[PDB]
Design a protein around this ligand. Structure first.
Ligand SMILES: *[C@@H]1O[C@H](CO)[C@@H](O)[C@H](O)[C@H]1NC(C)=O
Length: 345
C-alpha cells in the first residue's frame, strides 16, 4: 500500500486516514501528557484529523462525511507531500522518508515539511487553546528537532514565542467557531474561510524566509515549482477560494505527482495530463507577475480583493485554472484591474 498523490488511500481521504486519531484521547501519552511526533506523518495527520472531527458539527449539515469542512486543505496537502516524496530528506544524509528508511519520517531538510509544519502544529495548539477539543489538562509534548535554532517549534510556548502572529490568527479562526455555540448563529462560511486563509497566509509569510535555504536542496526545476507554488497560494488565498474537501482534491489532482527534474518543461511533460501541465504554467505565471512587479501586484491584488464581487470573479478564474482551461495570468489579472508589469532588466 502506497499513498496516491491525489486519491490518498484511494477515495480522496488521506493515506492511513482511519489510523489517525479522531480525538486527543486516542493519542499516545502518559496520564499527564500527550506525545506527538511532528516529524511523523501519522501524528501530523492526527493534528489535522482531530481538528476536523472537533469542528465537524459546524459543517455537518452541508455535505456528507465532513467534506464541507474548510480544514481539509492542508490535510489533503499532507498526503500529497508524502505521496510525492516531498516530505523525505532531499540531501542524502539520512534515509528519513525514503522507502528503504522510515517512510513515515518527515525530514527537517524538506522544504515542504518546513513550510507545512506550522499549519499542522501551531494550528493544533490554537485549537487546544480555544477549547475545540474541550478541557485539556495533559501537557502536549512534541518531538524536538535535531538542528540547532531550528524553524520547527517543539512546545506550545516556544511556538507562541517564535511565531506569535501565526498562533494569534489560527486562534481567531477557532474562537470564531466556538462563538457559534455561544450564540447559535449559523456559520458564516465566507467569514470562516477568510479567517482560516488569513492564518494560512500569515504562516506562509512567517516561514518563507526561514525555509528558503532548503530550496537549494532541490534541482532548479523542482525548486522553482516550490517558489511558484508559495507565491501563487497568496494570490489564491486572497480570492477566498474554498479549502474544503472537493476543492482541495481538485487542486492536488492538478499538481505534479512526482518531483520535477531537469528536462521537465511544462506544458510538455509527457507523463502528466493537461491539467497538471497547465497548472504548472499558471503557477509560474503568478510568479512571473509577482516577480516583474517587484511584489507590488500582490498588494494591488489584495486591495482589489477587498470587494466580495471581485473575489467572486476571481474565484471563477481559479475554477477555470483548475479545470485546465488555458489562461494567461497576466491577461486575466489585467482584466481584474492589475497593471501588467514588463521586464526592465
Ligand atoms: C463516506 O465515505 C465513505 C468512503 O469514501 C463512503 O463509502 C460513504 O458512502 C460516504 N458516506 C456518505 C454519507 O456519502
Amino acid at each position: 500500500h502506497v499513498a496516491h498523490p491525489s486519491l490518498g488511500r484511494g477515495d480522496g481521504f488521506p493515506f492511513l486516514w482511519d489510523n489517525a486519531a479522531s480525538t486527543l484521547d486516542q493519542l499516545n501519552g502518559t496520564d499527564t501528557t500527550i506525545i506527538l511526533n511532528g516529524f511523523n506523518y501519522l501524528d501530523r495527520l492526527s493534528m489535522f484529523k482531530t481538528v476536523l472531527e472537533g469542528t465537524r458539527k459546524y459543517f455537518d449539515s452541508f455535505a456528507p462525511n465532513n467534506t464541507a469542512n474548510i480544514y481539509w486543505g492542508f490535510t489533503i496537502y499532507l498526503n500529497w507531500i508524502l505521496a510525492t516524496g516531498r516530505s523525505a530528506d532531499p540531501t542524502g544524509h539520512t534515509t528519513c522518508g525514503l522507502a528503504h528508511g522510515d517512510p513515515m519520517c518527515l525530514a527537517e531538510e524538506s522544504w515542504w515539511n518546513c513550510i507545512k509544519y506550522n499549519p499542522a502544529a501551531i494550528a493544533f495548539f490554537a485549537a487546544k487553546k480555544a477549547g475545540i477539543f474541550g478541557d485539556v489538562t495533559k501537557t502536549i509534548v512534541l518531538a524536538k528537532p535535531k538542528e540547532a535554532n531550528s524553524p520547527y517549534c517543539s512546545s506550545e510556548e516556544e511556538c507562541q514565542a517564535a511565531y506569535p502572529d501565526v498562533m494569534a490568527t489560527y486562534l481567531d479562526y477557532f474562537e470564531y467557531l466556538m462563538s457559534l455555540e455561544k450564540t447559535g448563529e449559523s456559520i458564516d462560511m465566507d467569514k470562516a474561510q477568510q479567517l482560516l486563509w488569513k492564518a494560512h497566509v500569515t504562516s506562509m509569510e512567517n516561514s518563507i524566509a526561514v525555509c528558503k535555504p532548503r530550496l537549494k536542496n532541490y534541482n532548479i526545476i523542482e525548486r522553482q515549482l516550490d517558489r511558484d507554488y508559495l507565491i501563487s497560494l497568496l494570490y489564491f488565498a486572497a480570492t477566498n477560494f474554498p479549502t474544503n474537501f472537493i476543492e482541495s482534491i481538485k487542486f492536488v489532482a492538478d499538481m505534479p505527482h512526482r518531483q520535477l527534474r531537469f528536462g521537465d518543461i511544462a506544458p510538455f511533460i509527457p507523463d502528466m495530463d493537461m491539467k497538471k501541465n497547465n497548472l504548472l504554467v499558471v503557477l509560474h505565471g503568478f510568479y512571473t507577475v509577482h516577480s516583474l512587479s517587484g511584489g507590488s501586484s500582490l498588494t494591488h491584488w489584495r486591495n482589489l480583493m477587498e470587494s466580495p464581487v471581485s473575489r467572486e470573479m476571481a474565484r471563477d478564474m481559479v475554477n477555470l485554472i483548475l479545470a485546465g482551461t488555458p489562461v494567461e495570468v497576466q491577461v486575466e489579472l489585467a482584466k481584474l484591474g492589475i497593471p501588467t508589469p514588463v521586464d526592465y532588466k
